[PDB]
Design a protein around this nucleic acid. Sequence first.
RNA 1: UUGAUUUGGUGAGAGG
DNA 2: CCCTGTCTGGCGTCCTCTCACCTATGA
DNA 3: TCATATTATTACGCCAGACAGGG
Lengths: 83, 99, 50, 1335
Amino acid sequence: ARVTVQDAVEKIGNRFDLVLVAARRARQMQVGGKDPLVPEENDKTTVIALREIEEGLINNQILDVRERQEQQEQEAAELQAVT
Amino acid sequence: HARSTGSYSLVTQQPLGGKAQFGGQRFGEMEVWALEAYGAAYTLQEMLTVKSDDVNGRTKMYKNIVDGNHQMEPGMPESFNVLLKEIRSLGINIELEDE
Amino acid sequence: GQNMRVAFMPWNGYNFEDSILVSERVVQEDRFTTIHIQELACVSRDTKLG
Amino acid sequence: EFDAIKIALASPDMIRSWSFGEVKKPETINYRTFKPERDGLFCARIFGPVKDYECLCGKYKRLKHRGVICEKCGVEVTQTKVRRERMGHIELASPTAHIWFLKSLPSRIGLLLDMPLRDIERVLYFESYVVIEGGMTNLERQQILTEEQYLDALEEFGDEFDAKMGAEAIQALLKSMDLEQECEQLREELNETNSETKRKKLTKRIKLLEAFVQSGNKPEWMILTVLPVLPPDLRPLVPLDGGRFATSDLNDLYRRVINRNNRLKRLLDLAAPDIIVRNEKRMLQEAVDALLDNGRRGRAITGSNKRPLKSLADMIKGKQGRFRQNLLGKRVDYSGRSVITVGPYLRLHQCGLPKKMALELFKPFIYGKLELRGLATTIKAAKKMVEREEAVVWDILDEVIREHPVLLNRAPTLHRLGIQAFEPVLIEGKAIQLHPLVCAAYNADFDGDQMAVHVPLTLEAQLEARALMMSTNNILSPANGEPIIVPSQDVVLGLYYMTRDCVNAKGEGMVLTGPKEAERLYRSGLASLHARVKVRITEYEKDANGELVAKTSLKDTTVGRAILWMIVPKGLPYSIVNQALGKKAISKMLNTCYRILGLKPTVIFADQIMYTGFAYAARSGASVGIDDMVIPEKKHEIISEAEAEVAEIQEQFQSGLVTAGERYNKVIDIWAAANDRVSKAMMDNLQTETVINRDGQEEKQVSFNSIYMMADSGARGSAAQIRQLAGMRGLMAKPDGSIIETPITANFREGLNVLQYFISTHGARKGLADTALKTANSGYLTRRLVDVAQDLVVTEDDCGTHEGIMMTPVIEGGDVKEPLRDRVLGRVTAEDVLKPGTADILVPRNTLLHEQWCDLLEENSVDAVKVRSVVSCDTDFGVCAHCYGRDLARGHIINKGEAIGVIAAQSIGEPGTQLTMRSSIQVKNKGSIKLSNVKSVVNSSGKLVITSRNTELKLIDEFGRTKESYKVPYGAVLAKGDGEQVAGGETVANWDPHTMPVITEVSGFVRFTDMIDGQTITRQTDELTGLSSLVVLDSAERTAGGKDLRPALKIVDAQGNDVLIPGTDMPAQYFLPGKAIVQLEDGVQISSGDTLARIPQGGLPRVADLFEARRPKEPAILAEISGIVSFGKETKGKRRLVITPVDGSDPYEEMIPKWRQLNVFEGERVERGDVISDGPEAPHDILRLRGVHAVTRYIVNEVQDVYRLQGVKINDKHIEVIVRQMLRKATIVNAGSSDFLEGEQVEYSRVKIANRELEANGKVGATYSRDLLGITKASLATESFISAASFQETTRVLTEAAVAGKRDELRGLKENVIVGRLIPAGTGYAYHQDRMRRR
RNA sequence: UUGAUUUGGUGAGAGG
DNA sequence: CCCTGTCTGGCGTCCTCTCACCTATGA
DNA sequence: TCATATTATTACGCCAGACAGGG
Ligand SMILES: [Mg+2]
Ligand SMILES: [Zn+2]
Ligand SMILES: [Zn+2]
C-alpha cells in the first residue's frame, strides 16, 4: 500500500526526478513487457514503481544498465540470428 | 456534475461550459499558477493539451486509455493556432521557427 | 421551513465547520421532501428538407 | 519540434502567400436554403468544401479523386477543418494605414516620420494635404498643406510639384525614407546637442529607426494594401434554436469593408469627381480601422442595438481575449464539480467521491477494463453496459479507483495548497467528502461550498499527483514554516476539554500503572476525564545518534493527559501533553513531531489527533446556553459612574468652561476606560468563576464555562467577541470615520434597542463593503505578482559569491519585535559568522541555518548574520540554490528546478484579503547605551547635546545583542552619554520639536551679521510677557531691495575676532532661515546646547504602492553628491540648492520646491543617502543613492510592517525575489567597448554576460546603472512578448514587438503554458536540460 | 460507414 | 527654456448556477 | 424578396504619459 513517498524521495534525492524514474519504470511495467522486481499486493504500476524505489533497487542508473543489457541482447540476437 | 467526453464548442476545440450543456470544468488561471507552483509539469501538460484542446492528442489519448496505455501524445493546442490566425489576420506576420 | 428538535453539541465530527447532522426521523416523515416541477418544450420546426 | 516564435510585419507578398483566393463579394450566404455564396465572403474555390471530401454542389461522393475541381462547382476537395487554417485577402481599392501603428501611444508612424499625431490624422482622413519631394519650390517635405495652401500653390507651382494626401501620401513618405541616412543624422544630432529633452526625444526616435534596419521590416508595410481575412471556421456562422442565423461581429466588419471597396472600385471606374472619391476612400479607411481595432477611432460602430460590435483586436485583448480566456485557462474534460461535506472517518490522503461522479469521470478506464476481461467485445457494448449500470461494473470501478489519485480544487484557488491530490473512497451520495484538517488549507468551510475534481490521465500525472501534490505531502505552508494541517475547531475543543484538570473529581489523587488503565478507568466509570493522578509513563527520548532510549517515570498529571499520551509517537517527550493544549500548543505539538520524527509519524499522528479530538468532543457535550454568557454584577455601576462623568462634562459645557474638542475627547476617553473596566469585570467573572471545594475550604480554578473554553482553547472566539456577548460592545463609529460619543452600552445577551442596532449596522455595512470590494484588488495584486515573477526558476547550485544582505532583528522603538531566529531561519550565510567573543569560526560560510544552528546562535547571542539573499544572486536567468535558502514545506534546501517566483508571488498576494484596505524618548528596559551616527558636544550644564541630525540611539544589553533603537534629532538634551548604564524607565532624551535648535560648538559673543531691523528682521515686542525678541523674516515677505540679505549669527571672542571651528580655519556662522525668532539677543555670551533662534513649524494600497513603486506626493529630497551646500535664486518656480563637493566636481544642483521645511543649513556638509527634507522616500532614490541592498531592506521592512500590523507570517524570501524582479532592468552610463548605446536601457543579465565575456578578453567592460521598474512596467518590459502580451495591454506590446521584429526564445513558464508544452520549472526541467544540451 | 447545436453576445438575479 | 495644469488612455477577482432576448426596409 | 449601408447622453478613481503655456 502507499500513503507517503518519503523513503523514495530519500533514495532519489531530487523529489522531481522521483516522478521521472518511477514513470520510466511504470511504463516498463504497463505496456510494457517487464515484470516487477517486488511482490505486488494488487497495487497498480505507480505504487509498484515507487515501492521498488523505496527498497533501493531501481534508480536511473539501474534502468540505464538494464536498457544497455537489452540493447546488447538485441545486438547479439541480431548477429546470432543472421550470422 | 461530471464529464469524461462529449460535445465542445465551434470556434474553439475546448469543452463547453455549464451543466445544461454537458460540459467540463474551467481550469482557470490561478489553478495553472498553482500547478506551476508545484512541479506539476506533466499534469499541467495534459491539463491544457490532451484533456482540453488538442484534437489529435485527445483522440489518441482516448484510444490509448481504452487500450490500457496511459500515455499522451501531446501536440499543439488548437486555440493557439486560432490565436495565430487572429493575430496573422492583422498586418502581423507571426510564425514558428526552426526545428 | 419547519421546526425541529436541535441539540447544540459536537457529534463525532460530522458537524465540523458549519455542517449539520440530521436524524432519520427527518427523512422518514417527508418533512423536507419538496416538490419541483419542470416544464419541457418540444417543437417540430421546419428547419430544412421538409 | 520548434524553437522561438518570430513576429514581424506582413508584406503584401507575404499576405498573398498566406492567401488562397481573393474575397470579392460581401454576400455572406444564400440564407433561404443552406448554400453559401460563389464567390462571396464564405466562398468554395477560395477556401474549401463545407462537407468532408465532397463537392458541396455535386461530384466525388466516395474516396477516389480527392482534388478535382469542375467548372460547375468552383470548389476544392479536402477535410472539414481545412477552412479553419485557410485565410482570404481583400484587395483594398484605396490604401489604408494600420490603426495599431498610427495610434499606439506612441504611434509607430508618429515618431518615425517626425510628424505630430494630430497632423497625421488630418491628412489620413482626407482633411489635409502632404508634400512629397516637391522640387524647386519653397516648401519642406514634412510640412503639410491645406485647401488654401494647395489652391494657391496649384496656381503657383503648376509644374514640378507633388502634394498628395491620405495613406497613399503617407505610404510614399515612409517608402521614400532612407533609414540608414537618418541613423547617422540622428546619431550626429544626438552628439551635437546638450538639450536634455531633445536628447531623450532623439534617442527614442533613433532607437526605432535602427531597430527597423536590423530586421526585415519595411517602412511601407505599415499601410495596409492587401487586407487579410480571418478563416470562416474562426468566425463561425451558426444558427441558434429557431430559423435565423446569429451572425458574428467580424462578418459585419468584413462585409462592410467589402461593400465599401466594391463601391470605391466602381467609382474609380466611373471617374467620379474629387470630393466623392475622397469621401469614399475616407469611409474605406474608417471601415478598415474599425475592422482591425474598433473604437480606437471616434465612437465605435454598432449593429444591435447600441452596443458596439467586437473586432479582431477585441478578440485578442482584454479579460475575455484568447490569452486570458482560452490559452492560460481552458475548459477541461474528465472533470467534475459538486458540493462538499465532511466525512471525518477519512485518512488525510483520501477523500470521498460519489459513485455517480466516479462512473462518469472514469468511463474510458472502465471501458478498457471491461475489454480486458472479455465480458464484452466492441466499444458500443461497454457503453450500453455502463449506460445501464449493471451489477459487474461496480467491481470494475473499485478496481480502477484503487491507487489512482484525483485533484480536488476549491474554486478560488489562491495559493498552491488549493489544489491537492487525494485517493478516492466511493460514496453512496452526491457530495464530496473532504477530510477536515485539509479544509484549513482550502479556506473551505461547509456552508454551501463547491469543489472540482480533475483526473490525472497519463502515468506521469498519476505519479505527480502522488509524489508532489498528495495531501500528505502538503503539511507545511510554503509561505513560512508553519504547519497547514493544524487542527481547526472541534478537535481543539475536544483536546482542551480532555487535557485539563479540576480540583476534585472521581479518582482524585489515585495512582495508575499505565495509560492503558487510565483509559480503562475512564471508560468503566470509575474516574473522570480530568482528575489529577500520578501515572507511570514511559517516554522515549532519542538522545543518542538515532537510538531511542526509554525512560519511565511517574508523572503527576491527569487522566486525560495519559489517554492523549497513548496516541503521541515514541520520540516526543511527555511535557508536550502535560499542559492544557489550546490551539497554539497543539500546533507546536505537530511542529515538534515533524521536526523530530519526520513525515510519516506526523501524518499518522495528525490523523490520530483528529480522531481523538472528535471523539472526546462528542463525549464532552460542550454546548452553549443563555446562562453561559455571565453578565458582570459590576456592569451597571460602571455605566452609572460613566453617566455621572458625562453629566459633569456636559454641566461644564453648559457653563462654557471647556472647549468642544476637549469635551469630545474627554467623553471618548471615559467611555474607553469604562469599556476596559467592563471587559475586565466580565473577564474575571468568566476566567475564574468556578469555585469548588475539594475536602474542606473552597479553592478556585479556571472555569469550565462553555463560551470560556471556546475562547481559551482558541477554537472559535477571541477576547473581543466574548466581550461583545457579555460586556458592552464598545463605541461604534459612524461612516464619517469619526467615532460616536454615545456608545452601545448593551451587549447581545441584553437586548439592543433600535438606535444602538442602527449604529451597529453602520459599523457592519462598512465591513461588508470593504471585503466585497477588497477582494478585487487582492486578486489583481496576485495577478501582477505572478506575471512579474513568471520566469524565475532555481537553475544552479551555487552562484559563487560572497555578498548578501545583513539580517538584523527589526526594532521600531518598542520591545524587540521580530527576533533574529525568525529572519535567519533556513537561509544560507554569506560569510562565516564570528562567535561574539573573539574571532571564532562559530558557523562556517555556506551552512544552511536550520533549527539546531539557530539554537546555537541564540545561545551565543549573535548580533546579526550576513546571509545570502536572492537579490544578490549572480546567476544569469534564474536563482542559484544557495541564495534562495530553505525549501519552506520541505526541510532541505530548494531543489534544482522548483519554481520559486510563482510560489513567492502567491505567498505575498494570498494574504491580500486579511489585510485592511480603508515629545521625547522614554526607555522601557534596563541596559547599556550606545550611539551611532553621532557627532556631539558637551554643553555648559553637562548634558551631551548632538551636532548631528541623524543620530541613532541604541540600547545594547549586557550580552551584546541590540535590544532598542531610537532616532534622536539635531540638538537634543541627552540625560545620559556614550557607553553608560541606565535604569529601567529613566528618561534619557529630551528636545523641543516646535523650536529647531541652532546650538553651537564653541563659546564667545554674539553679533548680528546682516540683521537689520526694518528690512531683514522685524520688531515684535511681546504682548503678555514684555521680554521682546527680534523676529527674523523670510525671503518672501521683505521687498526686493533687501531680499538679498541673509540674516545670520557668528560667534566671536571677547575682542571681536572670529572664534574658529575646532579642526578647521573657518568661523562658525549660522545663517538663520525663514520664520525664525531670535531667542538670545545681542551681546549675550553663549555656550553649547543653547538655541540661537526659535523656529516653529496604509494597508493593502500600501502594499500596492510599494510593489508598483509609486512616488509619494511629497517625497523626501536627498543629495546626489557629498560636499558643502548653499542656496540660490530667489523664487522663480523653485528655490535653488547648490552642492559643491570637497574633492569631487561641482556642477550638481537641484531646485527645491520651497514649500518644504528643510533640515540642512548653509554651513552643513552632506552625503549621498543623507536627507535634506523629511517625509516618505521614493525607492528610485534609494536605489540610485544608497545601494541595492538598501532598497531591498526598505521594501521588505515596509511591507512586513503591513503584514505584521495585520498579523500574517510570511518569510522574507518572497519579498526579496519580487524585489529582484522589480530591479531587473538597467541603464547604461558608459557604453565602453561594447555594442550598446549611451543612455540605452538594457536588461541586466544581458549587459553582464556581455561585459563578462568581453572582460575575460583584454577589453575592459561596460559600466551600467541599475533601475527599479514597478511590477506592471517591469512585466510589460520583458524580452519575451508573449509574457508581456498575456498580461496587460496587448495592442502596445504587439505593435512594439512587430515593428521591432522581436523573437521569443521561449525560456519561461507562461510562454510554455501558452504554446502547449512542458513547463521549464518542475518535472519538465530535466526535459529542458535535455533539449538545451542537445542543440 | 451507426446521431446532433449551445457557446457567440447582452441584461437581470443568485452562491462561495 | 524648465515646471505645469490639462487631457487622454488604461487598468480595476476568481470559479459556478438560474432565467429572458435577439435590424428595418418593401416596391 | 433582396440588396441599402449608419443617428437624437452625462453620475468612477487613480495613475501614468504626453502636450501647449509661461517666468
Ligand atoms: Mg463559506
Ligand atoms: Zn465537384
Ligand atoms: Zn546566487
